[PDB]
Symmetry: none
């Protein structure tokens, strides 16, 4: 078994948040694995851009969710740190690793989320979004 | 005899104290192993910096706590020296190591702390803190 | 609960195995925490080098062991992956963290090992090294 | 409570060993405290040079001596690692920390050393010295 380190973001663009659809047909947030020597904030920005083609700015740390899963017979413990981001540039274009990447009005996003983990993160994110905007 | 000597910091910013959330979900103070050739004070400043992204200045030496634990059938002796710090700059951001990093009002901090050692150290820190202001 | 992931190495040179003498006087294998963004193989080669001054080359994955312990009343899970290595260069020189670093004939090393995990891993290592004629 | 790390050497020149005289008037081996980032072998070379003005080359690790003592109202667990060294450059001169620095024939050195640890380290060093043209 091994541990996996990932970081991603809840990026907002004028009342809308960036979401992606996983191979399992679940809408969640853009995230990705750490690169050698990166701090989580660095990983978060890079992976969001690579997965959605959208470049964002980190405003604050929201939280972390974790879970076990298997890949090729080995148990993997994954931890994902999430950061509140604000739109910079680019357009949503899902990489081959996600079924889709699209902006959704906050109202629309709330319902799409499945995993209680993502919903908790989004909730926290919205609250933090206030103090900043 | 295995001996693990660490150093940590109890940093304050306008009536608030800096705490980190450990993998056990318990809120505590940033601390880490004192590397060979490193003064405990340097270890404390570095660990606070690395785990929270907050830079602090040491005001005084609070105290030290001792405890043992068993690993692979062997007794290990551990001690942690704590230093009182005052905020200098930086914004609370957790490392891949911790779940969170946040400032808490003293009243609330006393509530979050769990380890008897953290409580004893915090109480000593509050008294030593008056010396300054 | 907190989970710790480490990696270590079982390195052979001219038919002998490299062991380190821990603070408790127990001879064991070098190992260390797998840093974020680090492959377990990188961790093993690095730890062997830092603890013994010996540079090794990964031959293959041996296996992993795990165990639990309590710290400050909290349960902690720890697992360690081990890799088979062949000597590349360097002389045994212990780090500040260990008492000694030395090569031992397999027969002697088997008697020196104490930790259950080390014994299990060494057994697997001995069966695996046959392929590389070490 | 704190840990202290030092390293030094049993350095030979033309069959003689380099000794220093401590403030307590005892002949012993040159050694000193680790600096930030140093491996023990690095500390040993630098400290022997600073303490005696003699540059030595490390040939092997001898062993270590450890003990608890009190410094400025605090218990310190000190570990001193020793290395067999070959003379390379310099003339012995005591630093401000020692009373003298001088080379002595092995037979005389054996008689001069007083601390049990020093005697044991010297015994080990002489055995290791046999493997080199030192
Ligand atoms: Cl597995
Ligand atoms: Cl990873
Ligand atoms: Cl990911
Ligand atoms: Cl620690
Ligand atoms: Cl362990
Ligand atoms: Cl380890
Ligand atoms: Cl601890
Ligand atoms: Cl003490
Ligand atoms: Cl020291
Ligand atoms: Cl010294
Ligand atoms: Cl040299």
């Amino acid at each position: 078994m091994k541990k996996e380190f990932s970081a991603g973001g809840v990026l907002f663009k004028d009342g809308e948040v960036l979401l992606i659809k996983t191979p399992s047909n679940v809408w969640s947030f853009p995230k990705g694995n750490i690169e050698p020597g990166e701090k989580p904030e660095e990983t978060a920005v890079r992976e969001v851009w690579e997965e959605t083609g959208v470049k964002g700015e980190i405003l604050d740390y929201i939280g972390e969710i974790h879970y076990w899963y298997t890949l090729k017979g080995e148990r993997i413990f994954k931890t994902v740190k999430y950061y509140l981001m604000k739109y910079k540039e680019g357009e949503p274009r899902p990489s081959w690793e996600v079924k889709d990447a699209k902006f959704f009005p906050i109202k629309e996003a709330k319902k799409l989320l499945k995993y209680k983990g993502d919903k908790e993160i989004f909730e926290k994110a919205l609250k933090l979004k206030e103090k900043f905007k």
